[PDB]
Amino acid sequence: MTNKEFSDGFSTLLNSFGITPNITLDEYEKSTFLTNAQEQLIIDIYSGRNIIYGKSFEQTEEIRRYLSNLVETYETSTKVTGKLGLSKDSVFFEIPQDTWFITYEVAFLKDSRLGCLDGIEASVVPLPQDDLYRAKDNPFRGPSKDRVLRLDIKSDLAELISKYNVDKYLMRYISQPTPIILVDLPDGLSINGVSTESECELNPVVHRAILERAVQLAIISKTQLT
Amino acid sequence: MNVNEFSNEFDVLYNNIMSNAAPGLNEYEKSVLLTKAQEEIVKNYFEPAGNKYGKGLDDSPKRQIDFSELIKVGEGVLNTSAPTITFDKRAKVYDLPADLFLVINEAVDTNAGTKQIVPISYSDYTRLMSRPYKEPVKYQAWRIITTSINNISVELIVNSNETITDYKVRYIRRPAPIITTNLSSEYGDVTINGVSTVSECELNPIIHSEILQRAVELAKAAYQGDLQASVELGQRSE
Structure with a gap:
């Protein structure tokens, strides 16, 4: 459906x-x-908390076809230099700043020490801070040639703890959807910082569900004090 | 029924049957009372509360056919002839037709299609410009009366990035006076609403009897002349 x-x-x-x-x-x-x-x-769909669907981000074809148009892939080789981390072998990478949830996250490694395995793709494992101390020395869940620990830090950063040097950082996340703006709004007004018309980028399958939920929200807004 | 028939039946209903017959009315007096009755009947019938039936302009077939011969459609002229101070920075000033009695429908044709004009009140203006958006709904436009001299000037507020092509106004034409005879005289030309020549009733014959009855009632109230009659029959002037 159009605007x-x-x-x-x-x-x-x-x-x-x-x-x-x-x-x-x-x-x-x-x-x-x-x-x-x-x-x-889309947040309820991603978390699987919608009772109507009751399915997670890619748990069925329906949800794939719904949130297919938010899945964005990202690549970066630059490292932020001045930051204070929880280990000596900690490198920091910027986040695209439009990310909502990281769904795939992998890291290529370039080091001499892992000889003849150089350029190995490595699985970035998001690890909580409780486990960090007891996972640094863990040879099965800690950093290694086939596994890297990522900790979230401030200013939209990702602290990658690896035993080997990290050259490249690959991501596939859910993006900020473009807002549904039906008219070029006057000066001052905006939705998500956008003032002009903005069409929904998802598939038409979920547009009518979005319309139904928006209608229900409208009635709730007008009928929450009466 | 033509002016001669108004005057003749006015005499018949006023003083040709009454027992202690009163002095006959001059044609100027009859024309005055007929014009006053005409305006009074129009104002009574436009407002539901003004007549005993509780029915307004379009609340029954009779009320439609009453104003059928008084409805007119014109266009507002863009008032860029001279500069002016608009209350709202984003309002285009338009001038309504001179012979305007009441506005019942307005519409504006923009580049984004036709939009119905909603005449917003001053309290509604204050409420609506307190909201973040400050623009009309999709298929409507807003309107407020602005500085008017010799004719109504109108401020139209449309959505942003919209230009107005025309502004049609379905209104009720101002009724023309009912004058029985050429009021030209050597002693001085008298006029009812600026015209001394004979002027027929330009409304439907369905309400000619109504106008005549109201004229007779006003004539007899003036004849009585006490404060009571004037006060109780002024309640219907409206």
């Missing part, structure tokens, strides 16, 4: 300007509620 179709369906479902009591929204309010419904729905 015009989004607005028209929103009005039709809300029974705007009908004879019965009803609710009429501005295009800014329609955009706000559509964006809120979109982001709520």
Whole structure:
């Protein structure tokens, strides 16, 4: 569905300007509620907390077809120099700053010590800080040629603890979806920092579910004190 | 029924049957009372509370057919002829037709399609400009009356990045006076609303009897002349 179709369906479902009591929204309010419904729905889908679906990020074909258009791949070889880490062999990499959740995260290694295995792809294991001390020396869950520990730190950074030098850092995350903005908003206004029209980038399959959730949010907004 | 029939039946209903007959009315007086009755009937019938039935402009077939001959459609002229101070920075000033009595429907044709104009009140203006958006809904536009001289000037507020192509106004034309005879005189030309020539009732014949009855009632109230009659029959001026 397009922005015009989004607005028209929103009005039709809300029974705007009908004879019965009803609710009429501005295009800014329609955009706000559509964006809120979109982001709520995709977060609930990713966490598997939607009772209707009850499935996780890629647990079935339906959810794949829903959130296929947020999956973005990223590559980086630059390392942030001045930072204080929890180990000597700690390197820091920037995050793209539009990430929502990291779903695939792997690290290529370039070191002489692992001879004839150079350029080995290594599995970045997100490790909590409780386990870090007892995982540094762990030969089965600690850093090694086939495994790297990533700890999240401030300023959108990723502290990669490896026994070998880390050359490249690969990611595949869920991106910020573009907001659903149905009209070029006036000066000052914006949704997610976007002022112009913005079409939903997901598939049309989930557009109608987003519309239903946005409508429900609208009625909740108008009918939370009565 | 033409002006001659108004005057003749006015005499018949006023003083040709009454027992202790009163002095007959001059044609200027009859024309005055007929015009006043015309405006009074129009104002009574436009507002539901103004008449005994509780029915307004379009609340029954009779009320439709009453104003059928008084409805007119025109266009507002863009008021870029001279500079002016608009209350709202993003409002385009338009001038309504001179012969305007009441506005019942307005519409504006923009590049984004036709949009119905909603006349927003001053309290609704204050409420709506307190919200973050400050623009109309999708298929409507907003309107407020601005500095008007000799004719109504109107401020149209549309959504951003929209240009107005035309501004049609379905209004009720100002009724023309009912004048029985050429009021030209050597002693001085008298006029009802600026016209001394004969002027027929330009409304449907369905309400000609109604206007005549109201004229007779006003004539007899003036004849009585006490404060009571004037006060109770002024309640229907509205």
